[PDB]
Ligand binder design. Sequence first.
Ligand SMILES: Nc1nc2c(ncn2[C@@H]2O[C@H](COP(=O)(O)OP(=O)(O)OP(=O)(O)O)[C@@H](O)[C@H]2O)c(=O)[nH]1
Ligand SMILES: [Mg+2]
Length: 301
Amino acid sequence: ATLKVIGVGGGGNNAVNRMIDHGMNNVEFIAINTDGQALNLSKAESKIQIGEKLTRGLGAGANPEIGKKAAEESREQIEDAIQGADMVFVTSGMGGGTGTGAAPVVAKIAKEMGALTVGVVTRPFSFEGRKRQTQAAAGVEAMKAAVDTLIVIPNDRLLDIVDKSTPMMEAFKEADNVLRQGVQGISDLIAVGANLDFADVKTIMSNQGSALMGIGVSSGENRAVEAAKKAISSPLLETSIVGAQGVLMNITGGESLSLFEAQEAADIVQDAADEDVNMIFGTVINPELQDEIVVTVIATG
Ligand SMILES: Nc1nc2c(ncn2[C@@H]2O[C@H](COP(=O)(O)OP(=O)(O)OP(=O)(O)O)[C@@H](O)[C@H]2O)c(=O)[nH]1
Ligand SMILES: [Mg+2]
C-alpha cells in the first residue's frame, strides 16, 4: 500500500518541508505550488509548478480563482504524480489563493483516480481578519466535497497550547503532528500484521466526512486507558470523537498485554462512539515494547 503526502500552497509546502526535515520515510512527498520560488526552497522529492501561464511563477495573490484555474490546467501533471497511490494526504492552509483553490482540485483528482483521499487543512488565525476566514471557509467546503475524510485544524487552537514565549516553529510543529499521527497510524495498521489491513481502512474511511487519527503511548497500571485517552484527544482538532460512526482501533503491547486492558481501552472509545458504531478492533503482540502499550485510533463519521 503506497502513501503519498501532497502539500499545496505556501502552508502546504512549509508543512512538507518541516516534516521531511524531521524525517518521515517510506512516504512519497509531493510539493505543488503556483509560487516558483517556494518550490525551489522545497525539500520535496517531487515538485509540481501549476498555473505558470497564469502567474508567471508568482503566487496566486490571495485569489482562489487563480489557484483553482492553475490546478485544472495542470491536471495531467497532477494525475501523473499521483498514479500508483493507494492513499493520498492533501495538506494545505486555507485562506490564500493557491491552497484554497487548488487543494480541492488536487484532492478531487486523487479520489476520482481511486485513491483513498484524506484532507488535512488549516483555518487562519482570527487576527488574519474576517475576509481571510470567510475565504478559508469556502476552501473547507470545497475540500469536504472532494475528499473521503477531512481533518480541519483551526490555527487559533495553536494559541491555546503555547505560552507567551513558545517559538512559532514549535507551535507549527505541533500542528504538523496531526498529519504525522495520521500517516504513521495508517502505515503501522497496514504493516504486517495486525489482523487488520487496508481493506479495513477503506471500510472505515471511504466517504465518511470527518476523521480523527490518533496514537497514544503509555505505561504503568492504568496504561491501556491512558494510551487510549491520549489517542482520541487532540486540542487542535475541530472534530471531537463523540458520535463516531466508524472506528478502526489497534492495541499493541508486549507479552504482558492482558485481555482486560484491551477491553478497558476499547470501552473508552466505545462510550464516545454512536450506538450503531462500525468498530473494527485489532491486537498485536510485539515483545519489543516491553512494558509499553500503544493504542491507535481512527474514528470517522
Ligand atoms: N499551521 C500553519 N498554517 C500556515 C502556515 N503557513 C500559512 N498558514 C496558513 O495558511 C493560510 C494560507 O497561507 P498560504 O498557504 O501561504 O497561501 P497560499 O495557499 O500559498 O496562497 P497564495 O499565497 O495567495 O498563492 C494562511 O492564512 C495561514 O493561516 C504554516 O506554516 N503553518
Ligand atoms: Mg503563496
